[PDB]
Design an enzyme around this catalytic site. Structure first.
Site, PDB file in Angstrom:
ATOM      1  CG  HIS A   1       4.894   5.908   0.906  1.00  0.00           C
ATOM      2  ND1 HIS A   1       3.781   6.654   0.562  1.00  0.00           N
ATOM      3  CD2 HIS A   1       5.703   6.746   1.601  1.00  0.00           C
ATOM      4  CE1 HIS A   1       3.878   7.860   1.092  1.00  0.00           C
ATOM      5  NE2 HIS A   1       5.038   7.943   1.726  1.00  0.00           N
TER       6      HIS A   1
ATOM      7  CE  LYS B   1       2.948  19.615  -2.501  1.00  0.00           C
ATOM      8  NZ  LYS B   1       3.275  20.733  -3.439  1.00  0.00           N
TER       9      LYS B   1
ATOM     10  CB  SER C   1       6.029  11.129   4.559  1.00  0.00           C
ATOM     11  OG  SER C   1       5.792  10.134   3.641  1.00  0.00           O
TER      12      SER C   1
END
Ligand SMILES: Nc1ncnc2c1ncn2[C@@H]1O[C@H](COP(=O)(O)OP(=O)(O)OP(=O)(O)O)[C@@H](O)[C@H]1O
Ligand SMILES: Nc1ncnc2c1ncn2[C@@H]1O[C@H](COP(=O)(O)OP(=O)(O)OP(=O)(O)O)[C@@H](O)[C@H]1O
Ligand SMILES: Nc1ncnc2c1ncn2[C@@H]1O[C@H](COP(=O)(O)OP(=O)(O)OP(=O)(O)O)[C@@H](O)[C@H]1O
Lengths: 156, 157, 156, 156, 156, 156
Positions: free
Chosen positions: F18, F42, F129
């Protein structure tokens, strides 16, 4: 980064997809160079000059753009250009992993050179230069598939 | 829709996977046209005429099948036969997005032209023409992968 | 096989892509059964009752289309209707190998049962139920993605 | 099984990715045969005999590795060496279902012959022969992409 | 690299895949450890102890295989076993890039730990644990998908 | 245009990848808004309060970057910031077609809103992630995969 992008390809021929990319990519840079490779490896259908003239003719009303040919490693063409940004297109049929591989291999050759990816409009999401070639080869209607500025020469 | 389907491909050569698609898809139409495309762009291992012979021989047992060769654009073929439905096969190694792409191209060239996808039997799920070509070119035995009616013709270089 | 096809799904909610598949597939079978799954594990946004009512409203115009609520294995649903064809949708985001797997899994449980795949129209190629649910959840405008008849019900 | 593996390839030229698979695979069998295919249908940049020489030079330090040059069907080669395990490398741009396909085919041509897949180190995961070739053909630094033992014979 | 391999998984339940892979990989190592992860966060259908029992029952005929249940980091389990090889199965539906990602993650957590990939027999290439679970959830017949010594434990 | 880009996501947690994307993307816009989304449906490992703090800590050094929490439609956020560009990252493990579908869905809700894609550096090409969450949850060391400024909070 925020100055001089290069968009490379074979442009055999240029399509409405290529033109969306040039458009969007255009907004984002000061000069944008459209870099027409020779791609002797890929069997070209149109001659580099035919191709370069077609793009030239399609790219004219984009006040930021310049079109040109080249032969060797894309990574060095960017060096010559004091260009740190490659523009590439992403579409439904792209080989994504191959694109990523090319971006890293370019980075590896020229440690300054990044790749950036743009997408075409939904209408042009499924256009490839390859299907357009066959349509032209078998004499189909490619007119909604390529920029009108090139209708003349696609017919010759 | 019931009247006429066309199954177009390079069929280089026709494989048991193809025959599954032809078997199942023929049941669904009055006539099935199997259309062998010249496909000069790829450098087909077998000639257009050899590929047409091969598939004719292989499809004789299907009463409502007719095999032609075309070097036309597939849209004109469709028009010629007043055909609104194309048939395509899906296998494990298919390039799925490229098949979708062909399906939209074919529609936009011929506005009533839809594509319908079939799958072969599980035994033939990993069979493509491309792996038959390689086995053959290396003098391997491909007779389990292709209908027995073409085996004479594959035997010639 | 021409007698009857079944298009099963969660239809959570029914979208314009689902209507394309219903339209084209209803043209090829004497009857088309639209079978609405429980989809428990999924925890759909819309209840079974809502999902079934939306399917019925959306499909009024197709005279040979019927709707039914069902539970569990596709294979048994298909034997119940003496049906040899399952209709499925294929899209850009389809997990294609998983589709192929399901088709074989279903033929294993029920040896007569083929799977046949349709695509939606181009403008619906990028439409998924899931995307439709984000827009409604986030209270966006989903009216160009779902049939007009459903629209009153889809608004919470 | 462990008595012998074969690692087939064009090796045009051998790259640091290939050397990782050779190293790891040699750790698992008593003997590993690295088999360099003429691959006449390709149009290899280097001749069979150079490719063979280069990979011999690159592997002399692995004492249980033996290289050979062959022409025809690999499944048959393997039978000649009493080999039951074909070694394949997976990398980022692998066509994964194609690999599986090849495995199943090789097994149908020789019922003792399983395929097993190794991966290279992360650094070499993005390396393709194809890319090394382009670089080599131009004025590029490939010295970080191929073993030192061979980087001489590259410009020869 | 020869003495010991670990084949990790949730095994929920064990299929005729977990097993072709156990068969094949166990021929390569002196000892194969089959490691059943608790996998708390996947809410497996079967409990840990049930999965362990299933896999023990199914691998009794393999003399160099041992089953263990665990839950920390797999890389640290490997360390405890002085294991340098993780065995993984590839199948038609595998997320291939995810497998490579995992192999690199583990390598970075345990610098001696490589990942090796096997395939099952063609007949089982389409078998997935989730497909077995769904058949089971819905009172289908899963007996041709799982080894016969676990069929009592799963019908229940 | 160039004045304003938005990079949205979960950032659960922010990773080195990121950060590579923020770095590069911040050099194309005067202002870059990192927009922290609410991970709805999520499985979020870290609280919104944590995620926003980790990313502020990690981006303190980039002077033209602001970090915000957004609980609305993304296309709409973009309208609110007068922003015509969404910045997104492309990785080895990306769902490529899903990413494209999102680009198109956002265009249809906000006709001015284009999506631009960056790659991270090679070292971070496989990081996501998701794999960071799994390594953290299993108590492994993720210190090489996340910026050093957020280690305190992770152990929270
Ligand atoms: N319809 C399209 N929309 C957007 N980008 C595209 C489209 N087709 C190609 N591109 C991209 O533009 C760039 C240049 O591609 P190029 O001119 O070489 O043609 P191509 O479409 O890749 O076909 P070929 O390699 O067969 O000539 C690439 O990044 C490519 O992915
Ligand atoms: N960077 C790499 N890392 C690991 N394995 C690789 C790499 N490149 C190729 N391989 C694998 O090693 C074996 C030999 O491959 P081969 O020599 O046919 O070359 P190739 O890389 O496929 O290129 P080409 O076909 O362009 O000559 C195959 O298993 C191949 O997939
Ligand atoms: N059909 C199959 N054939 C061969 N190998 C498989 C198959 N399915 C899984 N594997 C391999 O077996 C191991 C165990 O996987 P696992 O027990 O986690 O089950 P799974 O098939 O991934 O199901 P799930 O994750 O849905 O519980 C994995 O490392 C994978 O590499």
């Amino acid at each position: 980064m925020q100055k001089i992008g290069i968009y490379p390809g074979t442009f055999d021929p240029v399509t409405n997809g290529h033109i969306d990319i040039i458009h969007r990519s255009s907004e984002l840079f000061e000069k944008l160079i459209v870099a027409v490779a020779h791609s002797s490896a890929k069997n070209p259908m149109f001659s580099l000059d035919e191709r370069l003239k077609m793009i030239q003719l399609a790219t004219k009303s984009f006040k930021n753009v310049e079109c040109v040919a080249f032969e060797g490693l894309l990574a060095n063409l960017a060096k010559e250009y004091h260009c740190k940004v490659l523009v590439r297109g992403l579409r439904v049929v792209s080989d994504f992993e191959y694109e990523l591989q090319m971006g890293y291999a370019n980075k590896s050759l020229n440690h300054e050179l990044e790749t950036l990816y743009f997408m075409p409009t939904l209408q042009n999401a499924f256009i490839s230069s390859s299907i357009v070639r066959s349509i032209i080869a078998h004499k189909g209607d490619a007119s909604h598939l390529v920029p009108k500025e090139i209708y003349p020469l696609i017919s010759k």
